[PDB]
Each structure stands twice: as structure tokens, then as C-alpha cells.
Amino acid sequence: SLWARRENGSVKWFCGQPVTRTDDDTVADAKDGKEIDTKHLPSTCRDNFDAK
Amino acid sequence: FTLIELMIVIAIVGILAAVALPAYQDYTARAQVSEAILLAEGQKSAVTEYYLN
């Protein structure tokens, strides 16, 4: 998943394992078992649900 | 009285195997190591990328 965050006037994007959006400024691990394994993800797509 | 050609030639092939024994035994080991090396490599990729990233 790719998700963004309000920077206020702009946003910043993240890339990582599947996530769900909770509120307009918060997402969480779409923990379920179908996430692409860390070993297959680029160094640029290792973001965690709470990355800021 | 006679039969020594069969006796010596069976005993030269016997000693030939004994001389060919250590040659095949390090050529052999040296061959089994050359693979440990191939199995070790090809994993350089993962390690290299992990480090550079």
C-alpha cells in the first residue's frame, strides 16, 4: 500500500506493507496474512503504518 | 613355470588405483568445496542490496 499524510498545504507519501485508513491522518496494518514479505520490498518501500 | 603376465598386470592395476586414490580424493574434495562456494555466492546479491539500501 501507498498512503499519504497531511503536511498541511501538501502531503507526504509512504510505501510499505498493506494498511487501512482509520481517520484522515491515521492508518494501520491491514494485518491479515496477504502482505508482500519484507524481503521482496525495495529499501524505499519499508514504511511502517506509523511512519511520519 | 609360466603365468606371471596375469599376476603382475592384476597387481599393477591394483597399485594404479592406490596411486589414483589420493588424486581423485583431493580433486574430489576440491570439487565439493567449489560448490559450497557457489551456494555461498548468489546470496551476495541480497546482502549487497541490503547494505547499500
Enumerate helices (H) and strands (E) in chain A, giving the number of each: 0, 4
Would an 8 Å CB–CB cutoff place A40 in contact with chain B?
no
Residue type, B18: A
Query: Residue A29: enclosing H or E segment and its boundaries?
Result: strand A26-29
What's the rounded Cα separation, in Å, for the pair B24 and B31?
A: 10
What's the rounded Cα separation, in Å, for the pair A44 and A12?
A: 14
Q: Which residues in chain B touch residue A47, judged by CB atoms under 8 angstroms apart?
A: none
